[PDB]
Design a protein around this nucleic acid. Structure first.
Ligand SMILES: Nc1nc2[nH]cnc2c(=O)[nH]1
Ligand SMILES: Nc1nc2[nH]cnc2c(=O)[nH]1
Lengths: 338, 338
DNA sequence: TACGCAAACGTTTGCGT
DNA sequence: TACGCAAACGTTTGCGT
């Protein structure tokens, strides 16, 4: 305890502190002396004590959805550096889209008194929106929203509609007119948003799409498997499918193999995410890339700012995606005709 | 503040507390009354205050190596549930095998006063071992050690040597006598340990292995790529390779493709990890599976026990791996001869 | 029976001199 | 010049009555 180091140090605690935090000038002797005792006495200042005083834990919370999915894990890993190089402590908590679950992690959140709050709950029902607001006191920012759903938070928008668009365009220019689509859950942004972007181009190109060629996915490889399966299992099949996510595409890739179909010789897959190891998919995945890092870093920053600069007004910064050409896509049967 | 709810509640704080923690009987009126104010006044008890008093933060720290690699992310995700269903708060911090880095996260660790400590630093040099010990006060347990490296911690041993063994045996019985190997870093347990297991069987079967058929990997898909590449790029090539890790195998799978070689028609790949989505590799990955969940859950538990049961003696629980047959492996040219 | 007092936990910090 | 006092932060808890 400080009372213990000051003692061994034959100096006031006020002194022990002033040297611990270089908050005011202290003679060299006194300085050194404190230190020695600090070391021999083996002192570890109590952050909890210091925070009960200074009104800030210096730790930010993460109300995530899950932490194993490649997509998530990369953002999550991104944040942590940011937290660390800026002095913060990361508190991770996955709600699994569970209201109860979130209401709890949110609960312990404020209790432990997180200086700030990063959110990625995926689905945002009225109930959620509700609970979230009752903590509008604690600074926060949702990082996975299509557009600014609330006025009480900060947001980083991905322009995922623009991405869904970019993907379809590619297919078109490639020669395809018979595309399919295994989208991510519609309650989601990266779900509906991407699909909706992809579908503008279609109409923009008078391309229709039979319902039998559009199957819901949940970002789980198993789901990609089942869809791709469902797709090619019907008499008339498309020549190129737009896969809602990379790890789903990764799963759709598998099925086509066991299918006996070649890729991209038989099917053309265009994903979306650009996961750390999508380049090494087999084959190499052509895909849309989301700036996961910046989506992360940008978030942490807005928080700090709102924090340290006692910001009060909400905000929302956009981020942008870009096509990444790999090997899952070939020319369509209309390429030369354009 | 409590002083604020008790006031609005026209009752002593001692009362406000006794109802907040059901620590002693309180009349219904008084009870209800407190509550109302608790709600209208919108009170969030201060955990930091309560902990500065009760001597326990109710939060455990995670001094990980990294959090994006599938292997890690799965354990990490495992822990968090365990933490959550048992009432704890997860603090995540990746040291990136950086001494300085770890010494820091370890530093802030004790400061914030983690009730317990989970470790997975991969490489454990004397320097590390040193620093770690100076916190032997704070309860902990390394979860990625070959054998009990220290007497001041708890350990969960994976029997990764037994796994490396299981893998080689498979190859043998399959018909192979010309195997290769892309192992994970030797400073590691899952590195050296697995390799060393795999190599006993070899000798146990009078199988030698040309150095030109053994290439260091770092668990990174890119590394698997380069090795597999290096391997088949030499005049005489093996008929089956044992891949140190799944995500590396995943990377070796790619190269062979671009190689023009078929798998398992041309090469036979046997990985090790059994990652959440290795089944969906292309082809479906035959591999050794580590009980990631239990490796996680078991760890959290030992910690609690050491914690709540004020345990003092070190411990070490083993966990076991098992072969998972998929599609990356075919009979060798010696199968019928046995 | 049902509750209230004050002291304590481990720090920081405004006055001082 | 260089340092020391005491009060405060937001709770819990042993005596009480
Ligand atoms: N698994 C997963 N992948 C995604 N890609 C974009 N959004 C998501 C998401 O919420 N989950
Ligand atoms: N990436 C990675 N994979 C592993 N598989 C077993 N151990 C490890 C490790 O330390 N890192």
């Amino acid at each position: 305890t400080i009372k213990d180091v000051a003692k061994r140090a034959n100096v006031s605690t006020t002194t022990v502190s002033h040297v611990i935090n270089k908050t005011r000038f202290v003679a060299e002797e006194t300085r050194n002396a404190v230190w020695a005792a600090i070391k021999e006495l083996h002192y570890s200042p109590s952050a909890v004590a210091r925070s009960l005083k200074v009104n800030h834990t210096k730790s930010i919370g993460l109300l995530a959805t899950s932490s194993e999915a490649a997509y998530f894990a990369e953002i999550i890993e991104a944040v942590e550096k940011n937290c660390f190089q800026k002095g913060y402590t990361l508190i991770l908590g996955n709600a699994w889209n569970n209201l109860e679950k979130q209401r709890a992690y949110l609960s312990m959140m404020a209790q432990k008194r997180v200086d700030g709050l990063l959110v990625m709950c995926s689905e945002y029902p009225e109930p959620l929106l509700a609970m979230l607001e009752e903590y509008r006191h604690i600074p926060m920012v949702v990082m996975d929203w299509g557009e600014a759903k609330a006025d009480f938070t900060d947001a980083v928008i991905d322009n995922a509609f623009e991405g869904g668009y970019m993907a379809g365009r590619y297919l078109i220019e490639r020669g395809h007119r018979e595309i399919g689509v295994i989208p991510g859950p519609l309650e989601q942004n990266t779900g509906a948003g991407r699909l909706a972007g992809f579908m503008k181009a279609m109409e923009e190109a008078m391309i229709k799409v039979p319902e039998s060629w559009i199957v819901q996915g949940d970002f789980e490889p198993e789901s990609g498997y089942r869809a791709m399966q469902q797709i090619l299992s019907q008499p008339h099949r498309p020549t190129a499918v737009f896969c809602g996510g990379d790890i789903m595409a990764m799963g759709a890739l598998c099925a086509a193999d066991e299918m006996g179909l070649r890729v991209p010789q038989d099917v053309s897959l265009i994903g979306y995410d650009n996961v750390r190891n999508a380049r090494y998919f087999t084959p190499a995945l052509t895909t849309i890339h989301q700036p996961k890092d910046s989506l992360g870093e940008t978030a942490f920053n807005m928080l700090l700012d709102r924090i340290v600069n006692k910001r009060e007004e909400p905000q929302s910064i956009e981020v942008h995606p870009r096509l990444i050409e790999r090997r899952s896509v070939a020319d369509g049967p209309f390429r030369d005709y354009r």
